[PDB]
Design an enzyme around this catalytic site. Structure first.
Site, PDB file in Angstrom:
ATOM      1  N   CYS A 158      33.518  41.221  43.048  1.00 21.89           N
ATOM      2  CA  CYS A 158      34.762  40.784  43.640  1.00 21.89           C
ATOM      3  C   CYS A 158      35.954  41.108  42.750  1.00 21.89           C
ATOM      4  CB  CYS A 158      34.630  39.292  43.989  1.00 21.89           C
ATOM      5  SG  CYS A 158      35.010  38.370  42.655  1.00 21.89           S
ATOM      6  N   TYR A 221      52.645  47.215  33.157  1.00 23.55           N
ATOM      7  CA  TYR A 221      52.842  48.681  33.085  1.00 23.55           C
ATOM      8  C   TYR A 221      53.968  49.071  32.153  1.00 23.55           C
ATOM      9  CZ  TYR A 221      49.272  49.349  36.379  1.00 23.55           C
ATOM     10  OH  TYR A 221      48.025  49.381  37.018  1.00 23.55           O
TER      11      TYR A 221
END
Ligand code: TIY
EC number: 2.1.1.45
Length: 273
Positions: A158, A221
């Site tokens: 998952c 990021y």
């Protein structure tokens, strides 16, 4: 640290102590493993205030997820490396992915206009049935997968696990995500599962309690550092409220018009690539 202050402290901590680590693209993140934050849902809704969060997108996507839709265009018309298939890709058929797992886990897939009543495991009705039949149960657990991992004979793990909890008439939720994108996905996922919690609490006669957000790889990021640095200088404002407009009995009967955010005054939108 409390409220949105936890989220801001977690951004700071990743900026100061994160280690450089590349994701599957090959693009760069600052990363930290293991984090958690708790957001009270009592008389407030944790829609972040230090940038404006796309609330309508949060709602409409949750509604499409709950329907277990695998028709891309059903979300595109709300206005909001997974290759396979040919004419089905043009058509917009996504495959047995997203909400198809919450409502029909492990059912045989036909197409996206096909009739799946009573097929596969309805994880979401299970959660709601257990809350009503045994609120003390420790297994009121629902899972989501990333579409990419879903060969699914493979017994793939998952992507997220959501665990509910009931005591004193209050519904709480813990979301565990194996990876979390702090700039863009996290503020969205907070709103989204806190919304699910409000919905489930409403149809089960509970009061929302707490939302706990837990991550594995919490990352930023590289192209999200400067705008996040600036978000950190903004002072959070009191959270808005979420009001449910009519009395709903079944999770399937909720419509976008049943919901109303009140007293939401965020700082301005931040755009992040
Ligand atoms: O197929 C499964 C799977 O493909 C992935 C992850 C967990 C599972 C957990 C179960 O309890 C189960 O019966 C399953 O059949 C699966």
């Amino acid at each position: 640290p409390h409220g949105e202050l936890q989220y801001l402290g977690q951004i700071q901590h990743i900026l100061r102590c994160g280690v450089r680590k590349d994701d599957r693209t090959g693009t760069g993140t600052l990363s930290v493993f293991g984090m958690q934050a708790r957001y009270s849902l009592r008389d407030e809704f944790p829609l972040l205030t230090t940038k404006r969060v796309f609330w309508k997108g949060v709602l409409e996507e949750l509604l499409w997820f709950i329907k277990g839709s695998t028709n891309a265009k059903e979300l595109s018309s709300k206005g909001v490396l997974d290759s396979l298939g040919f004419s089905t890709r043009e058509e917009g058929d996504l495959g047995p992915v997203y909400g198809f797992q919450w409502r029909h886990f492990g059912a045989e897939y036909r197409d996206m206009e096909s009739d799946y009543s009573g097929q596969g495991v309805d994880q979401l009705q299970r959660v709601i049935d257990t809350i009503k039949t045994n609120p003390d149960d420790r297994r009121i657990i629902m899972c989501a997968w990333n579409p990419r991992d879903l060969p699914l004979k493979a017994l793939p793990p998952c992507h997220a696990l959501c665990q509910f909890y009931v005591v004193n008439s209050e519904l709480s939720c813990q979301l565990y995500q194996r990876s979390g994108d702090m700039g863009l996905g996290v503020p969205f996922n907070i709103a989204s599962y806190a919304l699910l919690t409000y919905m489930i609490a409403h149809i089960t006669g509970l009061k929302p309690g707490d939302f706990i957000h837990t991550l594995g790889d919490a990352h930023i990021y590289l192209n999200h550092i400067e705008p996040l640095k600036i978000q950190l200088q903004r002072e959070p404002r009191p959270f808005p409220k979420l009001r449910i407009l009519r009395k709903v009995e079944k999770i399937d009967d909720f419509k976008a018009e049943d919901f109303q955010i009140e007293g939401y005054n965020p700082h301005p939108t931040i755009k992040m690539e």
